[PDB]
Amino acid sequence: LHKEPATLIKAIDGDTVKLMYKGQPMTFRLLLVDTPEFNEKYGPEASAFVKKMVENAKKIEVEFDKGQRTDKYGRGLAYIYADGKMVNEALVRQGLAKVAYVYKGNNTHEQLLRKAEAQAKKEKLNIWS
Ligand SMILES: Cc1cn([C@H]2C[C@H](OP(=O)(O)O)[C@@H](COP(=O)(O)O)O2)c(=O)[nH]c1=O
Ligand SMILES: [Ca+2]
C-alpha cells in the first residue's frame, strides 16, 4: 500500500471528506470506520475532529487498499492521512468512530484500528462513555 497526494476541497462529516485526487474532485469514504451521522450523538464532535484535522494539515494523502476503490455510491474508499497521521485511526483512538464495514481485501489496517478501538474502549472515550 502507498500514499498518494490530494488536496482538501471540503470537510463533510465524521467519515466523508471532499478531496481533489489526480486533479478531479471526489468524495472519499474512510475505510473501516463508522462515525455517527451529524444528527446523532457525537456526530458533531466527529465532524469537528476530522474537519480540524484536514483543514490544519499541510499535506493530505490518500491510500487505497488492495480491493475496491469506489463504493456503490461513487465515493472513493481509502485511508486518509493528515501530515502522516491517519484520520481513520485517529477517530477510532478517540472513540469518535467504531471499527466497521470490514470487507475482505479492503482490510489491511484492520488490526491496527481494532487496537485503537480497544484502547478507546478501555479509556471509556466519547462513544464508549
Ligand atoms: C465503509 C464502506 C461503506 N460502504 C457502503 C456500505 C453501506 O451500504 P448501505 O448504504 O447500503 O447501508 C454504506 C454505508 O456508508 P455510510 O456509513 O457512509 O452510510 O456504504 C461500502 O460499500 N464499502 C465500504 O468500505
Ligand atoms: Ca456514518
UniProtKB/Swiss-Prot annotation:
Ca(2+) binds at residues 15, 34-35. This is Nuclease A. It comes from Staphylococcus aureus. Residues 109-129 are annotated as: Disordered. The active site is at 29, 37, 75. It comes from the Bacteria. It is found in: Secreted. The chain holds residues 89 to 223 of 231 of the full protein. Residues 109-125 have a biased composition (Basic and acidic residues).
